[PDB]
Design goal:
The structure is a homodimer. The first copy, chain A, is built from ten helices and twelve strands. By secondary structure, chain A is α/β, with parallel strands linked by helices. Chain A folds into two domains: about 180 residues, D-Maltodextrin-Binding Protein, domain 2, CATH 3.40.190; about 100 residues, D-Maltodextrin-Binding Protein, domain 2. In chain A, strands 1, 5, 6, 7, 8, 9, 10, 11 and 12 form a nine-stranded mixed sheet that branches. In chain A, strands 2-3-4 form a three-stranded antiparallel sheet. In chain A, a hairpin with a 5-residue loop joins strand 3 and strand 4. The longest helix of chain A is centred in the first third of the chain and has 17 residues. At the A-B interface, helix 1 and helix 3 of A face helix 1 and helix 3 of B. The complex binds glutamic acid (2 copies). It is classed as transport protein.
């Protein structure tokens, strides 16, 4: 039976499960401009909601969707503004001090988006340039560290979400946008002219996405992990991958044209929740 | 503007304010058996709810009542199961490490309820006796300490709420109930034979009640304290006192017959939030 102060207890007492989600983490958790929140990560959220309804024996449980940002997600989690989110949040040791993470749902590398035919091909080319990054991200930490340690004299623009960052780039307010490679591709899949944008640079990190939930709630983490493990080991996660990464997606019917990583091939066979 | 991770932000983002309340803290926050949650403390909760609706310019804001207990209130608070509660929670330094408290709304002393016809006149008379206390309370802490340090050989029965404690006493399962004096009087007011029961003993503590809210949320504490201050300094709090403590109350139409202390009168003129 759920313990006082656990998430299943909160949900049962409120009669609501509150699902945090992203607005612009494409193709993970984002708005389709068809009145829904969709994507590869959001498909896990939907599965988790069904598992909660089943566990609590409450099929008419209200489901509330609450938008969150990379900057605000931990504060909102910790006061119960939302109960869990599946999007584009990196599981790392630092964040484990504040939150818990499910089994890994995706793996990314941090790279650059830049205009084609410009002069940015590697991180070193950013010296003395304006560079945009989304506030509250691992890329913002990495980029500020690079700026200091490698003395690059970058002017770092911190934007509120990934589409704001992309539009900074698109409007010529920055020469490159640093982010998780998949998210860069996702922003390009919404662009005016997708052709105009290239992903370049050696990755500065390799990072695991997990669904995020409150710390010290083993029962809820187990529900989430068990749900993820069924999706992944049954072959369903790979079908979700193909849908969101190899086929036309909203809102512009463009294709990511990605291929499934070796890292996720191994995780779909034996799910785990380790930070990289 | 409410910061991310604050209670006003949570309320706005969820479209609801969740008010924790008691079931058996008489005459503070309790069920009237007329389909309402009522009492002297709950009157402050209603005032705070109105202040929230005004501050957020949300006149139709949903209000959800959630029952809590002495044992589960801090776990439930910390994961956002509820946003605030006004009842019978003591503000003390230890709990300030986990929660915040409003300006004080009442002051109690921890005493004993026992058969008027019986042998229990002070705490020392409890040696070798069965004594009931409500789980998760300051009285439970005090009573276990007294048992150990004074080697009293009491058999301590820990019941889930104040009415369960009283009914333990009434049914002959314990010789006395230790609790806040006002709460003892409130349970007596519901008894089969109220006249059978006496409040005895030297108080083991003097304790201040506050409404409880999350820690590190100055703006919500300020809204609550501002609301309380107006009620108290205008004379309304004493009218609420008279209503709940000097006139017949539900559910049995009996009277507490209490008098407002000079200390409370002094607080009502200049509100403050200090633990005793
Ligand atoms: N995965 C990165 C960037 C993407 C994001 O936050 O959406 C992070 O968790 O900081
Ligand atoms: N005021 C005490 C006892 C009453 C109660 O919890 O309701 C406490 O906060 O522990």
């Amino acid at each position: 039976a759920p313990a006082a102060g656990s998430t299943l207890d909160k949900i049962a007492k409120n009669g609501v499960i509150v699902v945090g989600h992203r607005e612009s983490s494409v193709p993970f958790s984002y708005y389709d401009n068809q009145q829904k929140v969709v994507g590869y990560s959001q498909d896990y959220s939907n599965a988790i909601v069904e598992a909660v309804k089943k566990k609590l024996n409450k099929p008419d449980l209200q489901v509330k969707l609450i938008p969150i940002t990379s900057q605000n997600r931990i504060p909102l989690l910790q006061n119960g503004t939302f109960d869990f989110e599946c999007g584009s949040t990196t599981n790392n040791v630092e964040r484990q001090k504040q939150a818990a993470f499910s089994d890994t749902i995706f793996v990314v590398g941090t790279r650059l988006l830049t205009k084609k035919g410009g002069d940015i091909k590697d991180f070193a080319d950013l010296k003395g340039k304006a560079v945009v990054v989304t506030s509250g991200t691992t890329s913002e930490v990495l980029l500020n560290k690079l700026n200091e340690e490698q003395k690059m004299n970058m002017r770092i623009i911190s934007a509120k979400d990934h589409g704001d960052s992309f539009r900074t780039l698109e409007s010529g307010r920055a020469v490159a946008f640093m982010m998780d490679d998949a998210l860069l591709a996702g922003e390009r899949a919404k662009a005016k002219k997708p052709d105009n944008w290239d992903i370049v640079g050696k990755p500065q990190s390799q990072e695991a996405y997990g669904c995020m939930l409150r710390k010290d709630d083993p029962q809820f983490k187990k529900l989430m992990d068990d749900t993820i493990a069924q999706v992944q080991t049954s072959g369903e996660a790979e079908k979700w991958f193909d849908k969101w990464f190899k086929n036309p997606i909203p809102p512009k019917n463009l294709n990511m044209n990605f291929e499934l990583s070796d890292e996720m091939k191994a995780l779909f066979k034996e799910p785990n929740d380790k930070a990289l």
